[PDB]
Amino acid sequence: LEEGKAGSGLRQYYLSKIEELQLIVNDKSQNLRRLQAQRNELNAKVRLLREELQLLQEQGSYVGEVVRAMDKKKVLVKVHPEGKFVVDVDKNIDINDVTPNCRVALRNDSYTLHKILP
Amino acid sequence: AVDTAEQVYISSLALLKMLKHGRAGVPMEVMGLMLGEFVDDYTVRVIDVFAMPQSGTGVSVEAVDPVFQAKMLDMLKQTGRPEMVVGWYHSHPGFGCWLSGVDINTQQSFEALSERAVAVVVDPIQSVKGKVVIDAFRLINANMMVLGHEPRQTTSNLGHLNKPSIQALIHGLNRHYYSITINYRKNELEQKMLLNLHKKSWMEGLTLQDYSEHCKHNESVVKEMLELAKNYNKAVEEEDKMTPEQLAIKNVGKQDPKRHLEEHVDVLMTSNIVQCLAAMLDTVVFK
Amino acid sequence: MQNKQFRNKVLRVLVKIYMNLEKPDFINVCQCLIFLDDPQAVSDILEKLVKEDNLLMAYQICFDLYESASQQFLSSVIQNLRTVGTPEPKDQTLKMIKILSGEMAIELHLQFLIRNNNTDLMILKNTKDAVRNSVCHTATVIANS
Amino acid sequence: DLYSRYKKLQQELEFLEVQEEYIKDEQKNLKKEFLHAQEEVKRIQSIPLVIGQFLEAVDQNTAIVGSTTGSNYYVRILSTIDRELLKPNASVALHKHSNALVDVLPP
Amino acid sequence: EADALIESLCRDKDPILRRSGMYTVAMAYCGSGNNKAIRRLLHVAVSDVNDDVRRAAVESLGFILFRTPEQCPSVVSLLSESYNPHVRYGAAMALGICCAGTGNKEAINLLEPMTNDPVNYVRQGALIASALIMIQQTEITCPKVNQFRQLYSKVINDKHDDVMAKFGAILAQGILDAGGHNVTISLQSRTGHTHMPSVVGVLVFTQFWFWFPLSHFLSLAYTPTCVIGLNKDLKMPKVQYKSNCKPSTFAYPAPLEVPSITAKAKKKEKNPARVMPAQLKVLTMPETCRYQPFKPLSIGGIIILKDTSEDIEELVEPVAAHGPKI
Numbered sequence: 001l002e003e004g005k006a007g008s009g010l011r012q013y014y015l016s017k018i019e020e021l022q023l024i025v026n027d028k029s030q031n032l033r034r035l036q037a038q039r040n041e042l043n044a045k046v047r048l049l050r051e052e053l054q055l056l057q058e059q060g061s062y063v064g065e066v067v068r069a070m071d072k073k074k075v076l077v078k079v080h081p082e083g084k085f086v087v088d089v090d091k092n093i094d095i096n097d098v099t100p101n102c103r104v105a106l107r108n109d110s111y112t113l114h115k116i117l118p
Numbered sequence: 119a120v121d122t123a124e125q126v127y128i129s130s131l132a133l134l135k136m137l138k139h140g141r142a143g144v145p146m147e148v149m150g151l152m153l154g155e156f157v158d159d160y161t162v163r164v165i166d167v168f169a170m171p172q173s174g175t176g177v178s179v180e181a182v183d184p185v186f187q188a189k190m191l192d193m194l195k196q197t198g199r200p201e202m203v204v205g206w207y208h209s210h211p212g213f214g215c216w217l218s219g220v221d222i223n224t225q226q227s228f229e230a231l232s233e234r235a236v237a238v239v240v241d242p243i244q245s246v247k248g249k250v251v252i253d254a255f256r257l258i259n260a261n262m263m264v265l266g267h268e269p270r271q272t273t274s275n276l277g278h279l280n281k282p283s284i285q286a287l288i289h290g291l292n293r294h295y296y297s298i299t300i301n302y303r304k305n306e307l308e309q310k311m312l313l314n315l316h317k318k319s320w321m322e323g324l325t326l327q328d329y330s331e332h333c334k335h336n337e338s339v340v341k342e343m344l345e346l347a348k349n350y351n352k353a354v355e356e357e358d359k360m361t362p363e364q365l366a367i368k369n370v371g372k373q374d375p376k377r378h379l380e381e382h383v384d385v386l387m388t389s390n391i392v393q394c395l396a397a398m399l400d401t402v403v404f405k
Numbered sequence: 406m407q408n409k410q411f412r413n414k415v416l417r418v419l420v421k422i423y424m425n426l427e428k429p430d431f432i433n434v435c436q437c438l439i440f441l442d443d444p445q446a447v448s449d450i451l452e453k454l455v456k457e458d459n460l461l462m463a464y465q466i467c468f469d470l471y472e473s474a475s476q477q478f479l480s481s482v483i484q485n486l487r488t489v490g491t492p493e494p495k496d497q498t499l500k501m502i503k504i505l506s507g508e509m510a511i512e513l514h515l516q517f518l519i520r521n522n523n524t525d526l527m528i529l530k531n532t533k534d535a536v537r538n539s540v541c542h543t544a545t546v547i548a549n550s
Numbered sequence: 551d552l553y554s555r556y557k558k559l560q561q562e563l564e565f566l567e568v569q570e571e572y573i574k575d576e577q578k579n580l581k582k583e584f585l586h587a588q589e590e591v592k593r594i595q596s597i598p599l600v601i602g603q604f605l606e607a608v609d610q611n612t613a614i615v616g617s618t619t620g621s622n623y624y625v626r627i628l629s630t631i632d633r634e635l636l637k638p639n640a641s642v643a644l645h646k647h648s649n650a651l652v653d654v655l656p657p
Numbered sequence: 658e659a660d661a662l663i664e665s666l667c668r669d670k671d672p673i674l675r676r677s678g679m680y681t682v683a684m685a686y687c688g689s690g691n692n693k694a695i696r697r698l699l700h701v702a703v704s705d706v707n708d709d710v711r712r713a714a715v716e717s718l719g720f721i722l723f724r725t726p727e728q729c730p731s732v733v734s735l736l737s738e739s740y741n742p743h744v745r746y747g748a749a750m751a752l753g754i755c756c757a758g759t760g761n762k763e764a765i766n767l768l769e770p771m772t773n774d775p776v777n778y779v780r781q782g783a784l785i786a787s788a789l790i791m792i793q794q795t796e797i798t799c800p801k802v803n804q805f806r807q808l809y810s811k812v813i814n815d816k817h818d819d820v821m822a823k824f825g826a827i828l829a830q831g832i833l834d835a836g837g838h839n840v841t842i843s844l845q846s847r848t849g850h851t852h853m854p855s856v857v858g859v860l861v862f863t864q865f866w867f868w869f870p871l872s873h874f875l876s877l878a879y880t881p882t883c884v885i886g887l888n889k890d891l892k893m894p895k896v897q898y899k900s901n902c903k904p905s906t907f908a909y910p911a912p913l914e915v916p917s918i919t920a921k922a923k924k925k926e927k928n929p930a931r932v933m934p935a936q937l938k939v940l941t942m943p944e945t946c947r948y949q950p951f952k953p954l955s956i957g958g959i960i961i962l963k964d965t966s967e968d969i970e971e972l973v974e975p976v977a978a979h980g981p982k983i
């Protein structure tokens with residue numbers, strides 16, 4: 001016999017070395033695609049900075065200071081002069097966490113709170 | 119009782135007329151007319167757009183001089199322009215792209231003839247030079263308030279139409295007052311004429327002209343920028359002199375937003391202008 | 406990942422072996438006639454059904470041929486079968502006619518699919534809880550479809 | 551199986567082969583896109599702008615800024631600027647429209 | 658044949674027709690007979706500036722590569738989170754079509770980043786791609802509760818989600834509900850040959866994006882899973898095999914109220930029910946079964962039954978009557 005065990009056997013050994021070559025093409029494809037995921041996420045990150053660019057076009061946002069919380073979920077907030085804008089802040093943030101007589105982060109037009117500030 | 123899904127075709131003709139008109143977008147209200155042809159219900163194409171002389175009243179139905187309007191229109195008709203008006207546009211600088219009561223009322227009067235009656239606001243004043251975001255706006259019918267608001271089919275492009283998402287104007291004023299999507303068209307004569315026009319706007323005349331200039335500014339000017347390049351390099355190397363102690367202590371977490379690498383890659387890329395232009399000198403010296 | 410330049414010939418000569426065997430096998434005549442798609446490789450087996458005079462064996466290969474593997478080759482082989490027969494006369498006629506239906510499959514689909522169905526008020530009531538008159542109104546009825 | 555593993559495997563050789571020039575195309579194109587968006591966010595930063603004053607940094611990469619008019623503004627600062635420019639009493643300079651900081655000025 | 662045609666039309670100035678070269682070059686090249694078109698499909702996917710050909714790109718790649726479930730999501734893995742949202746969405750189409758009818762978890766484990774993103778496109782086609790795999794799947798085999806509940810949370814989250822996202826959400830929820838779990842889809846036949854109107858139904862069904870009433874052509878691809886033991890054309894027997902696995906493992910996820918072996922299988926009178934392709938190796942005909950075909954029922958499909966006894970008591974059962982049907 002001695003071919004499928006020996007001649008096609010070493011042909012299969014050469015196929016195993018070809019699997020080593022596809023382990024080289026394999027791991028090159030791995031690390032080059034991880035580099036590709038890095039550039040995708042970084043260029044995607046400055047693309048998300050272009051998503052922030054509309055909030056750059058917002059001219060920034062103001063500084064709210066709540067002095068009194070109102071029970072109708074419409075919080076009076078002391079603003080910079082010609083302010084005192086009573087408003088419901090954003091729905092993802094509860095009202096009771098916002099403690100009165102403390103400074104917060106407020107958008108300049110939509111008047112939704114971001115966070116409590118020290 | 120029917121409404122469809124319309125989409126506005128915008129050429130560069132109308133666009134640069136609104137950009138010359140946006141350079142003519144000084145603080146005062148300005149006036150212009152959009153023209154073209156309506157081929158069906160749910161597609162609309164603009165070609166012809168001109169501007170109008172200002173008045174102290176500003177944008178008004180009284181500002182529209184109808185014999186001057188139709189006079190210029192007929193002078194376009196004796197030229198190669200047999201197109202009806204497709205809408206009227208203007209600029210709203212500073213206070214945002216939305217439309218006042220005068221705007222909605224002269225819109226209400228100018229939509230009696232054309233059922234589509236496109237209204238466009240160009241505002242390059244607070245628009246940056248990075249993006250030229252412009253939108254075409256629409257009037258809803260007041261008797262459609264009982265039913266659902268906009269029975270527009272094919273809701274794919276509305277994901278692109280939520281790009282106007284400023285948190286006061288669009289949905290702050292979106293009731294009784296909606297908008298329409300904008301796509302473009304560019305044929306190959308515009309594409310290659312404008313393309314080689316712009317590449318030529320970045321290239322030279324005979325194009326071999328400014329080459330040897332910077333090849334020989336590598337010998338006159340850029341040598342100073344090469345020494346200063348070595349000064350920023352060595353001026354970082356005095357910082358990286360201290361770094362292997364830090365890397366020889368902590369190795370956990372990163373505290374410096376300064377990277378020291380990609381800047382110096384860029385310094386090498388600027389330094390390779392010498393190498394790339396040396397062979398250019400070899401070609402000029404050859405023949 | 407054949408280039409078909411040898412493969413169809415390899416198959417049309419590898420179907421010459423089972424006709425020389427004691428029996429025809431149906432997996433090989435399927436798996437050739439789904440690839441080579443040859444009328445000359447079906448013109449034999451359509452008229453071997455008469456020479457074998459066997460009703461039961463033809464019906465499997467007939468049903469998956471009218472099921473699968475072709476449209477216009479089926480439209481050619483059905484009129485190749487139309488010339489076959491009378492222009493066993495009485496039993497071959499019901500064979501060649503009732504194989505070319507394909508609607509017995511549709512009738513059984515209507516019968517088990519008329520008796521296996523499962524609908525729930527949670528899904529459709531959940532759609533009616535979520536329905537709006539403009540966009541998802543068609544999503545509700547396409548889910549119903 | 552055993553001798554079929556060869557020619558079965560050759561298709562995996564080809565399918566892993568085809569990812570080579572593909573990852574070449576991605577690695578050549580997306581860095582060009584990276585300098586596209588890099589230069590495009592660079593040309594947002596324009597030199598005519600308003601100068602404010604810094605008051606406090608309440609968390610990382612987002613802070614508050616006293617405007618020249620005295621009204622305090624809440625701006626997420628731009629990511630490229632490091633923590634040296636988070637100095638509390640500083641001569642900060644935002645944009646006139648974007649109102650994000652390019653650079654602070656030496657007093 | 659059409660290689661010069663499609664390569665000629667690939668250099669078109671028209672982006673629509675540039676998409677149409679790819680949509681066209683799918684059905685010429687299906688079955689992964691071409692390692693050539695993948696080069697220029699991916700090359701127009703990365704290279705081109707217009708996202709129409711880029712979200713239009715990889716669906717033809719699924720249409721050629723439908724033979725292997727394994728090799729697809731590894732090479733759409735970078736495209737899962739791409740640069741633009743459109744290659745993300747077309748990648749959701751590609752994982753939708755390459756993994757349809759299967760049980761490959763390599764598309765499934767990538768859905769958990771796909772289900773949460775600021776873009777409603779990838780959120781919608783994340784649910785569309787999620788709808789195409791979980792069909793005909795039991796929980797005891799594979800952990801699907803996460804995509805069940807995120808599929809369920811959208812029709813209560815429809816207040817705070819996008820209006821087009823919820824459309825693909827509940828529209829995706831009908832896909833599991835399709836036919837009362839009985840009917841499914843398949844990209845290829847029992848012979849390994851692929852069905853033409855299944856491909857037509859799935860690609861035109863992916864063309865619902867531009868025109869939404871075209872999604873009604875999905876029904877042309879509906880492949881009911883059952884068996885056939887029909888002996889004579891007008892005679893119905895009753896055929897009972899047995900399954901070598903647990904009958905509780907294979908059942909229907911019976912919903913809320915809201916006002917180690919089976920002794921035999923439950924498919925009878927041939928009402929054969931739905932059947933997994935993996936159940937076709939655990940089907941067991943009884944040795945005490947009275948009638949038995951000439952062909953060994955080895956894998957599920959269409960066979961006839963042979964009368965082994967050749968006597969009286971064929972056990973004729975009647976037919977139904979007028980109603981919602983004829």
Ligand SMILES: [Zn+2]
Nearest residue numbers: 147210211213
């Ligand atoms: Zn004004």
